[PDB]
C-alpha cells in the first residue's frame, strides 16, 4: 500500500469523486449489485497532458482501495524475444485472475497504443489486441479491474470503447494557477511555510505548468530552504525553484 | 568481482579543487556537511540533500571521486565502477547490487559511489534487468534513500536513468 | 531393418533399363553411373519428372542428406533395404543428389560419423562392383561441386557419364515460359526476347516459380492478364 | 474497372451505350494506369479502338511503367491497330519501362507489316535500349531472319555493341544460326570486335564455324 | 459500426448458443512478424474450414487490417493487402464458399475496402443500431431486467429521447444512472435520475461521439 492519500490534492473533487466512488462502491457494496444488477466497468481512461500526476494520484486512490497495488509500464511489453507480450498479458490476468482482489494501474499506454496502417507497433497490436480480446471475449472478467492512464490522446485507438474496455473517459486538463496553488499548498502543508503568502506572485509565475512540476518546485524549495539558513520557507523560493528547474 | 571491487585506500584530498568555486560547494555541502551535521539538516530542514551529478567531458575525471573518498573524517568508502556488470552469465548483477546494498545496510548507513553508468545504460534486455532493478534499488528506500546519489558518465545518451533520475 | 543430355541419358539410361540381360547381350560395359554438374542451372527436378513420366516403374529419390542422422549404422540398413527391394521388385532408379557433402576426404576423427558413412560409401562402392552382373537397378547421380569429390567415385567403370549444365538455359527458358503461358491467359503484348536475353546475364533457378510469383502479383484482379510489370517486378523482387 | 471487362470481352453495344451514357469512362483508368485503349489494344479489338481513337483519346497515354499503346499494337501482331495508332500520330520511338522501342517488340512477333509501318513513319533502325541492344539482337536471339532482312531494307547497323560488348554477330553465332551469321557477315558484320569476356565471334562459334566465318570474310 | 453497438453480444450470442464450434479468427493473428508468408495460414485455416464440414468464421475489428491502400503502401501494408489478395483469390477466385460463413465485424463503415464491398461476398448489410422504437424498448427491457426501481415506470421517455445510441453503452448509461442514484445510497431508484442521467450522460456521449 502507498503512503499518500486522496486528501493531498485540491480542486479536483468534481472529477476525481467519480473515480473515488468507482473504487469504493465496487469494493464494499457488492451486495447491492444484485438488487440493481450492476457490474462495474473494468476500463477507466485517465488521460490528460503529461506531468499532471496521473500516476501518484491514481496511487493515492489506490491507498483508499486498500487492495494490492501493482504497477506496469507500457514499454515493458516491447521485448527482444517473440511472444513475450502474451506471457506478460496472461501474467497480468494470471495474478489478477488467480490472486486476491487487487489493483493493477498501468501508465504510458499511449506510447504503445499506435494504430499503424514490418512494424513494431503492429506487434504491440498483436499483444494489445490480444488484451482487448481478453477484455471483450471474457464475460467472467467481472473480477479485478484494470486501470489505465495515457499521457496524450493524439493516437486514439477507436477499438477502446466497450463496457469492459476504457469507457470511463474523464478529461484531466492542466491545472490552473488556483488548482496548482491548491495542490502545492496541500503538498507543502508540512514544511514551515511563511504565513505571508498571498499566492499572487506564485500564481502569476505558474503559467501553463502541471501538477508534478509544482511538486518539483515544492521539493526543490525543501532542498535549498535547508541551505538558505532560515528554517522557515521564504516567498522567493517559489520563483527561485521555478526558474531553477525550469 | 564483488569482493574484488572492494576499495579502502587513501587518495586525492580536497587540495585538487578544479577551479569550480560554486560547484565544489554544491557538492561539498552534500558530501562533507551532512555527515558532520546530522541534526542540523533534520531540524533545520526535513532531511539532508541527496547528491550531485558529475558528467559531461571526461577531462580530469575521477579526481573528484578520490577527493570525496579521502575527504571523509571517519573512513574512506567503497566506489563501484559500471564496466564490471557487462560480463558472461547475466543475472549475477541482481545478487551483486542486492548484496552490496545489504553490506551497505551492514556498514551503518555508509555512502556508495557508482561510476560509469554508461557501461550499464543506453539486445540489451538482459542489461535492462540489472539497470531497471538498479533503479528499483535506488528509488526504493529499502537500503537507504538519504545517503548518496551520484553517477559519472561521458555521454548523456542514457535516457532511462535521465528520466528516472528526477525521482531521487 | 540441347538434346545431348536427353539423348545420352535416353539411349544410355532408358534403353538398357527396358531390357533384361541386355548387359549380357551387348558386350558388357558399365556406363550405368550418370553424373551431372553445374551449380547455376536448377536441374534435378524436371529431368527427374521426365524420367518418372517416360518410364512407368519405381524410383528412389534420396537426396544426399537422407542418411545424415545420429545412428551411423542406419545408412547400410536403409540403402541395403533399398538395394534388396530394388533388385527384387523392379529395376528402379536411385537418384543420389549432392554427393559433395558425403564425398569429401577426411583425416581427423572429430567428424568420425562422416568418415564412417564414407566408409559405408566404400562398402556399397564395392557392392556395386559385385553387382556388375545383371543388377535390377539404376544409379543416376547429380552434383554441384567437383573440386572436393573423392577420386574413387570418378574412377572409370563406375561413372562413365559426366554431363554438364550451361550457364544460359535459353531453350529451357523458352520451354519454361511456354509451359506456364500455355495454360495462363495469353497476352499478345508479352515478349520473351528481353526475358530470354536478360536471364542470359542474370541467370537463376526456378523460373517457373518466378512466373508463379508473377501470377500471385497479377491476381490483383485489376490486371486481367499478366504483363511485363509483374515479370520484371517479379525479377527484381526474387 | 467495368470498362476493363467491356473492352476485354469485346462488348460492342455495352461499351457504346456505356460511353454514350458517360463520356468519362473513356478517360477513366484502373489502379494499374491502364485506360480502355490499353485493354482494347491488348485484346486486339478493331471497332472499339476505332471509337476511342475516333473520339480523340490521347495516343501517347503511358502507364506507370511507361508502356505506350504502340508497343501493345506492335507486339500485338494486329496490323489494323498499328494503322490506327500510327494514323493518330503515335510516337514511333516511345520510351517504355526498360527504354525499349516498339521495333523490338514488333520484331519479337516477326510481323513484317508492323515493322514496315513503324520504320516507314520515321522509327530509328538502330534504336538502343538501356542495355544498348537493338531489335537485331533479339530477332537474332530467336531466329527472325526476314525481320533482320527488312531491318536491312532501312539501312540498319549490324555492329551494335550490347551491354556485354556483343555484336549481333555474337548473338547470331551464339544462337547457332548459320545462314543468319553468313548473311550478317556478307552484309557488313565485324568479326574483330570483342566483348567483355575477350572472345571473338570465331571462338564463340563451335564446330569449326569460325573458319567458314573468316573464310566468308576474306571471300 | 454506425452509432450503435452490440455486435459482440450478437455474434457471441449465437456463438454462445451453438455456433457448432468456437472457430474465432482474431484480426491480430495475421501479424506475421517475419517474412509475410501468411498464405500458409490463410490456406491452413481456410483449409481446416474446407476440411471440417461445419464451420463458422468470425472476423472482428477488420478495420485495422482493412487499409484502403490509396497511396504507395510500405512493406507492412503490402503484406496485409497481399493477404487481402489471397482473400480475393479464395472468395471470388477459383474456390467457392457455399457452406462456410464469415462474419466481418468492424467499427467505421468508410474505410471498408470498397474492392471488398462487392455484393459477391457481403450479401446483406446489418446496421447495428436502435432505429425501431420496439427494438430500443426491447433492449431497454432486457438490460432493465435485474434493476429495481420505484413503481412509477415510464420507458417511452427514455426510448423517445434516445436517438441513435449504442446498445452496450446504453447499458453503461443506465447503470451509470444507477450509480448516480446510488450516490445518495437509496435502495429505490426513481426514474427522474434515469431521464436526467440518461439525458445528460447520453449528451456527453454525443459530445464524445466524434
Short mmCIF file of C-alpha atoms in Angstrom, two decimals, chain C residues 15 31 33 37 50 53 74 78 92 105 122 187 209 222 238:
data_model
loop_
_atom_site.label_atom_id
_atom_site.label_comp_id
_atom_site.label_asym_id
_atom_site.label_seq_id
_atom_site.Cartn_x
_atom_site.Cartn_y
_atom_site.Cartn_z
CA UNK C 15 17.28 -48.30 -73.40
CA UNK C 31 28.21 -46.82 -68.13
CA UNK C 33 26.53 -44.30 -63.41
CA UNK C 37 27.27 -30.94 -62.89
CA UNK C 50 10.65 -36.52 -67.28
CA UNK C 53 6.88 -39.84 -66.93
CA UNK C 74 21.25 -46.70 -40.28
CA UNK C 78 18.27 -48.04 -45.50
CA UNK C 92 14.08 -48.86 -60.11
CA UNK C 105 38.17 -36.71 -47.85
CA UNK C 122 33.15 -47.52 -49.89
CA UNK C 187 -1.33 -11.71 -73.81
CA UNK C 209 8.23 -20.40 -59.75
CA UNK C 222 -7.29 -5.18 -61.67
CA UNK C 238 13.15 -12.54 -56.07
#
